[PDB]
Amino acid sequence: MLKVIAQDFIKPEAIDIVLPLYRELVEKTRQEPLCLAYDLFVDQKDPGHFVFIEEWPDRAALDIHCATEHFTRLVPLINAHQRQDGTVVLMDAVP
Amino acid sequence: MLKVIAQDFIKPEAIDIVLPLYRELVEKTRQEPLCLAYDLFVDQKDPGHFVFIEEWPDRAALDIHCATEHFTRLVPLINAHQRQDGTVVLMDAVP
């Protein structure tokens, strides 16, 4: 499987705007046939620092995720309010 | 629950040395009664960029984790080979 961590840094002013967007993103993503796990967290010291922890079967299933209606609609609406670029790490389990 | 992501950046010449240290750290940490989850991953684009995803019932249990002999022994053995400081993020689930 493919494990992903993605981090967004949202302007503090914008947190209340983006929360509903994140909630829909999580709900719709979890309904993707190929999504194994998808959970969203927030940094205890930065209420605007959001972290996705995701598990996909492979890269192809992640490409599908990236092309979905909900991803392509919701993510730029979220990123409109970023304080800095986000980061994404793609990973393998350490055996 | 308390969700934690910790990242280490290990000098490439030291990857083969640290891998068995990581394996033992993971094995012993999962045996801590308070450990809810603990898994180790590696960045697909950097074989020296290791990522722990951890779950603890609370911060007290993290404190205890930090005091174990396996943590106090293995962690500095690993960090002796770091390329740059590691990072840690403590997190809450977003409902």
XYZ file of C-alpha atoms in Angstrom:
190
model
C 0.000 0.000 0.000
C 0.837 3.678 -0.374
C 0.770 5.884 2.744
C 0.483 9.668 2.334
C 0.849 12.582 4.731
C -0.244 16.010 3.443
C 0.016 19.223 5.444
C -1.761 22.513 4.867
C -0.914 25.807 6.636
C -4.022 27.959 6.622
C -4.117 31.704 7.499
C -5.611 31.940 11.011
C -8.287 34.407 9.751
C -9.561 31.696 7.354
C -9.924 28.649 9.634
C -13.711 28.949 10.059
C -14.132 29.276 6.270
C -12.103 26.133 5.485
C -13.380 23.774 8.187
C -16.683 22.971 6.326
C -14.657 22.422 3.123
C -12.324 19.984 4.930
C -15.352 18.140 6.406
C -16.884 17.587 2.930
C -13.465 16.625 1.473
C -13.086 13.943 4.184
C -16.643 12.625 3.773
C -16.467 12.389 -0.058
C -12.928 11.014 -0.129
C -13.878 8.190 2.275
C -16.642 7.273 -0.205
C -14.086 6.690 -2.989
C -14.097 2.965 -3.894
C -10.284 2.745 -3.664
C -9.735 4.781 -0.486
C -8.421 2.534 2.330
C -8.136 5.161 5.101
C -8.386 8.962 5.194
C -8.270 10.956 8.399
C -7.708 14.610 9.123
C -5.970 16.058 12.188
C -4.990 19.455 13.497
C -1.720 20.576 15.192
C -2.261 21.226 18.930
C -0.103 24.391 18.743
C -1.424 25.763 15.397
C -5.242 25.532 14.785
C -4.566 26.322 11.133
C -2.033 23.510 10.543
C -4.064 20.593 9.142
C -2.649 17.138 8.491
C -4.092 14.390 6.309
C -3.056 10.786 6.885
C -4.111 8.647 3.945
C -3.732 5.080 2.777
C -4.218 4.089 -0.863
C -3.775 0.700 -2.710
C -1.241 2.324 -5.060
C -0.306 5.511 -6.879
C -3.007 4.982 -9.540
C -5.721 5.104 -6.880
C -4.130 8.368 -5.617
C -4.236 9.799 -9.175
C -7.987 9.012 -9.257
C -8.411 10.772 -5.910
C -6.638 13.869 -7.303
C -8.983 13.979 -10.346
C -12.286 13.587 -8.451
C -14.953 16.294 -8.495
C -14.659 16.829 -4.728
C -10.818 17.107 -4.737
C -10.654 19.477 -7.730
C -13.457 21.671 -6.344
C -12.603 21.687 -2.617
C -8.776 21.766 -2.559
C -8.212 25.022 -4.502
C -10.969 26.642 -2.387
C -8.977 25.604 0.699
C -5.629 26.574 -0.765
C -6.908 30.084 -1.603
C -6.329 30.712 2.112
C -2.878 29.062 2.625
C -0.166 30.980 4.497
C 2.629 28.995 2.754
C 2.729 26.112 0.248
C 1.530 22.771 1.607
C 3.587 19.592 1.587
C 2.831 16.015 0.517
C 4.918 12.911 1.394
C 4.381 9.585 -0.409
C 5.629 6.554 1.564
C 6.198 2.818 1.857
C 5.912 0.815 5.060
C 9.287 0.041 6.649
C 9.427 -3.774 6.927
C -6.612 10.416 21.103
C -3.222 12.052 20.751
C -1.939 11.538 17.179
C 1.758 12.095 16.517
C 3.880 12.351 13.365
C 7.646 12.374 13.902
C 10.138 12.648 11.039
C 13.860 11.836 10.983
C 16.343 12.762 8.215
C 19.223 10.342 8.219
C 22.533 10.761 6.302
C 22.462 8.375 3.297
C 25.719 6.690 4.317
C 24.001 5.703 7.614
C 20.722 4.163 6.379
C 21.953 0.561 6.670
C 23.151 1.197 10.241
C 19.873 2.742 11.486
C 17.402 0.310 9.908
C 17.864 -2.441 12.520
C 17.659 0.208 15.259
C 14.307 1.406 13.817
C 13.042 -2.196 13.625
C 13.772 -2.799 17.320
C 12.337 0.599 18.334
C 9.102 -0.250 16.524
C 8.910 -3.792 17.953
C 9.490 -2.633 21.558
C 7.295 0.455 21.294
C 4.324 -1.564 20.090
C 4.759 -3.655 23.244
C 4.237 -0.610 25.520
C 0.825 -1.222 27.196
C -0.228 2.380 26.470
C 0.781 2.316 22.774
C -2.376 2.421 20.622
C -0.639 2.403 17.213
C 2.891 2.821 16.003
C 4.061 2.426 12.431
C 7.156 3.441 10.546
C 7.331 4.552 6.910
C 9.966 5.830 4.504
C 9.688 8.646 1.912
C 9.513 7.207 -1.666
C 11.747 10.041 -2.863
C 14.252 9.941 0.067
C 15.331 6.552 1.553
C 16.767 8.430 4.577
C 13.521 10.309 5.406
C 11.675 8.170 7.939
C 8.215 8.925 9.296
C 6.537 7.561 12.414
C 2.758 7.725 12.788
C 1.792 7.113 16.415
C -1.369 7.074 18.521
C -1.449 7.446 22.308
C -4.434 7.850 24.699
C -2.964 11.103 25.954
C 0.211 13.119 26.491
C 1.061 11.274 29.744
C 1.512 8.077 27.740
C 3.827 9.905 25.303
C 5.893 11.091 28.287
C 6.185 7.499 29.405
C 7.127 6.368 25.911
C 9.982 8.935 26.042
C 11.282 7.477 29.331
C 11.428 3.811 28.205
C 14.865 2.146 27.952
C 14.281 1.335 24.274
C 13.569 5.011 23.513
C 16.436 6.382 25.628
C 18.891 3.866 24.149
C 17.846 3.629 20.482
C 16.842 7.240 19.753
C 20.295 8.795 20.377
C 21.960 5.889 18.487
C 19.775 6.879 15.532
C 20.108 10.650 15.923
C 23.919 10.341 15.960
C 23.512 9.867 12.177
C 21.055 12.654 11.454
C 21.417 14.982 8.429
C 19.300 17.645 10.162
C 17.058 17.959 13.210
C 13.949 15.762 13.216
C 10.470 17.242 13.645
C 7.511 16.171 15.749
C 3.836 17.255 15.524
C 1.201 16.456 18.246
C -2.359 16.441 16.954
C -6.081 16.233 17.601
C -8.570 14.550 15.282
C -10.746 17.012 13.335
C -14.379 15.839 13.928
